[PDB]
Design an enzyme around this catalytic site. Structure first.
Site, short mmCIF file in Angstrom:
data_model
loop_
_atom_site.label_atom_id
_atom_site.label_comp_id
_atom_site.label_asym_id
_atom_site.label_seq_id
_atom_site.Cartn_x
_atom_site.Cartn_y
_atom_site.Cartn_z
N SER A 61 -28.29 -18.16 -16.78
CA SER A 61 -29.14 -17.09 -17.30
C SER A 61 -29.78 -16.15 -16.29
CB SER A 61 -30.26 -17.67 -18.15
OG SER A 61 -29.71 -18.25 -19.30
N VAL A 62 -30.03 -16.64 -15.08
CA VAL A 62 -30.62 -15.77 -14.06
C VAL A 62 -29.72 -14.60 -13.68
CG1 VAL A 62 -32.20 -17.50 -13.14
CG2 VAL A 62 -29.94 -17.26 -12.13
#
Length: 324
Positions: A61-62
């Site tokens: 997700s980053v």
């Protein structure tokens, strides 16, 4: 003549060690960068090799802010544009979210870290366009930071991709970055659209950035990312009292461990503050937490919170809102 700040280094070390013990994890890393120079303010690992630079991960997700940034920068979409975010198929594979929503606007896609939404934004671009963008962020590229054993990560040649590969890359799987590369990529968001070089030496000359997106786009993306650390976002555990924080959190995957193959889940949290006028980027990874949480935000959020808050205090930056 190192750029590292001993007070931040000590803080990062203490907070990392606290989390690794509490979550009975295998290893961990914290990187703190100056958000406008690329200088390393702190870099700590659990004992052994310099994992921050040696070890690449599929970030998860980053990575999501970047396709969103590309989409906004292109002028093809607006933050108010709405997407169908129901699960969908690419051949036999399914792209789906943790929590399902039928539709989200781009703001919501950021807020909820939607795999589907992020993948549909990426899908507006050709493989070459997306590859060129990730390459411009430094994915697969040597930083030449001054550290030995520096991983370049992995960005597969687009000429060999599949539509499912482009989609998974947009939500952080099927490409690989080190934590230091990830922190560096975030300079595009903090340094008004320009990728900075990374250095552990005190700078004598202002660094030359490489423009990747418009400053206006970077500003908008930072605004959108604040929602991730407020009620409704995945990164609430990383909120810092007195500040607005733009961040992402997620479960990354580690497929290489030194010179050997591996398969490990890695909790990750990366963000910057103050969100409107950022001074610091803090990036945290904790490898294979086995106690008191698996969910990435619970594991790494508190480390991020303490390191970010402490760093802003150490650097003398005043809170932008009253404390709760």
């Amino acid at each position: 003549a190192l750029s590292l700040d001993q007070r931040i280094q000590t803080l990062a070390y203490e907070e990392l060690n606290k989390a690794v013990e509490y979550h009975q994890a295998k290893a961990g890393t914290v990187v703190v960068l100056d958000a406008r120079t690329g200088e390393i303010l702190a870099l700590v690992n659990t004992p052994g090799r310099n994992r921050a630079v040696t070890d690449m991960i599929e970030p998860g997700s980053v990575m999501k802010p970047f396709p969103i940034a590309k989409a906004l920068d292109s002028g093809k979409v607006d933050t108010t544009d709405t997407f169908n975010t129901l699960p969908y198929k690419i051949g036999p594979a399914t792209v789906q979210d943790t929590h399902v929503y039928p539709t989200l606007d781009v703001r919501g896609i950021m807020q909820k870290s939607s795999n589907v939404g992020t993948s549909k934004l990426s899908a507006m671009f050709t493989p070459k366009e997306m590859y060129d963008f990730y390459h411009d962020l430094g994915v697969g590229v040597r930083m030449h930071s001054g550290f030995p054993g520096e991983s370049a990560g992995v960005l597969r040649n687009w000429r060999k991709w599949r539509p499912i590969e482009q989609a998974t890359m947009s939500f952080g799987y099927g490409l690989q970055l080190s934590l230091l590369q990830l922190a560096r990529a975030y300079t595009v968001l903090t340094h008004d659209g320009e990728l900075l070089p990374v250095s552990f030496e005190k700078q004598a000359v202002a660094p030359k950035g490489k423009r990747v997106i418009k400053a206006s786009t970077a500003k908008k993306v930072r605004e959108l990312m604040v929602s991730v650390t407020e009620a409704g976002g995945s990164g609430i555990a990383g909120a810092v009292d007195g500040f607005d924080v733009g961040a992402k959190t997620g479960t990354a995957r580690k497929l290489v461990n030194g010179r050997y193959v591996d398969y490990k889940h890695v909790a990750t949290f990366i963000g910057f503050a103050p969100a409107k006028n950022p001074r610091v980027i803090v990036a945290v990874t904790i490898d294979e937490p086995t106690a008191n949480g698996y969910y990435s935000g619970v594991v790494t959020g508190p480390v991020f919170k303490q390191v970010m808050g402490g760093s802003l205090n150490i650097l003398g930056v005043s809170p932008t809102k009253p404390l709760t």
